[PDB]
Design an enzyme around this catalytic site. Sequence first.
Site, mmCIF file in Angstrom:
data_model
loop_
_atom_site.group_PDB
_atom_site.id
_atom_site.type_symbol
_atom_site.label_atom_id
_atom_site.label_comp_id
_atom_site.label_asym_id
_atom_site.label_seq_id
_atom_site.Cartn_x
_atom_site.Cartn_y
_atom_site.Cartn_z
ATOM 1 C CB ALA C 2 -0.939 -0.002 1.199
ATOM 2 C CG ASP C 27 28.809 1.596 -26.046
ATOM 3 O OD1 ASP C 27 28.924 0.433 -25.608
ATOM 4 O OD2 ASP C 27 29.434 2.010 -27.047
ATOM 5 C CD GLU C 47 13.112 7.962 1.153
ATOM 6 O OE1 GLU C 47 14.085 8.726 1.323
ATOM 7 O OE2 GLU C 47 12.037 8.093 1.781
ATOM 8 C CD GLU C 63 4.398 12.415 25.103
ATOM 9 O OE1 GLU C 63 4.280 11.171 25.158
ATOM 10 O OE2 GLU C 63 4.612 13.129 26.105
ATOM 11 C CE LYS C 72 8.987 10.484 12.568
ATOM 12 N NZ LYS C 72 7.770 11.300 12.850
ATOM 13 C CG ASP C 73 16.254 15.293 12.590
ATOM 14 O OD1 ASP C 73 15.457 15.609 11.687
ATOM 15 O OD2 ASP C 73 16.252 15.834 13.717
ATOM 16 C CB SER C 76 16.427 12.882 6.979
ATOM 17 O OG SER C 76 15.017 12.730 6.984
ATOM 18 C CG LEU C 93 31.471 5.571 -12.699
ATOM 19 C CD1 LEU C 93 30.435 4.558 -12.218
ATOM 20 C CD2 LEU C 93 32.794 4.894 -13.072
#
Lengths: 90, 116, 98
Positions: C2, C27, C47, C63, C72-73, C76, C93
């Site tokens: 989902a 190529d 990710e 909360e 979370k930081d 990231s 490259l």
Amino acid sequence: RQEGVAVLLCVVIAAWLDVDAVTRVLLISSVMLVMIVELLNSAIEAVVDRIGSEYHELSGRAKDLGSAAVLIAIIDAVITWAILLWSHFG
Amino acid sequence: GFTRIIKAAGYSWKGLRAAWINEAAFRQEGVAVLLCVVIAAWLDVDAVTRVLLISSVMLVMIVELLNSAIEAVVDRIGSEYHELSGRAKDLGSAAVLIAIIDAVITWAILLWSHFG
Amino acid sequence: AAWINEAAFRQEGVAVLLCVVIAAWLDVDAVTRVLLISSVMLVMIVELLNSAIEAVVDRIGSEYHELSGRAKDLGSAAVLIAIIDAVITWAILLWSHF
Ligand SMILES: CCCCCCCC/C=C\CCCCCC(=O)OC[C@H](O)CO
Ligand SMILES: CCCCCCCC/C=C\CCCCCC(=O)OC[C@H](O)CO
């Protein structure tokens, strides 16, 4: 814990094949990445089970996202081996 | 679209800043990673070799950060001892050691092939 | 699955997908091709791990706690380093490719 068997076999095959250093590093790195992502995935699900055993929309979401990552790493490992072995035997 | 990147970039900088301020070991690792990227940037090697030297140490950082994120969640739940708490941190630390060994070996293999 | 029906993952997923398709058509030698492909796929992996962690945090509650933001930081920041590595890989490259 049969996952370590797969890894050892790959390293044996990579060493057994007569490939340059760079190719051998990629073959083994791709397998190592799979192992890293699986361990990180198992850590996340350990935390999910630490919070609670009951079902929750975000717990499933966490496990589904972790599993998708492992899948992506597996696909990437298979593409790597395919591409490199095709080049070696071309 | 542009607003999503700016916000995520802000979170990312708070994340690097916090990990850096909070631990000497993280700072010394970041030193080690920046020295390797610099050395790889100045080595007379082929482009693919250059990428592998850089990627192997950057992966060290990625796993370090991801593992610190999990540790923060575990410490968020509670500092009290729990089986899955210890287990989460164990699996996380293993992942960090693998990436670090894989970088050391990659560097050893490639620099040995480049020198003699 | 989902999560694959969300605008956030779709925009990130379609970018990684295009890079893999471009790499498949370029190529270049084999080891170069493997590197172009696996670097953008690493962005996708990280990710996904970062959203997994974000999900666990939100699971705990709405909360706010300092370690919630920190988790979370750091997640990231991991994504950011992966993206930098992909840009660096493609730059090194394909600069030579010309
Ligand atoms: C949906 C997943 C895919 C389907 C399942 C696998 C099917 C494999 C069958 C035949 C092999 C055909 C030839 C394979 C070798 C091949 O493509 O060789 C060219 C070189 O790779 C170019 O460098
Ligand atoms: C998910 C769908 C899978 C479908 C099944 C096939 C998967 C083959 C793997 C990679 C394709 C990369 C591009 C292939 C051509 C390619 O890379 O050729 C130069 C090589 O370096 C050999 O010299």
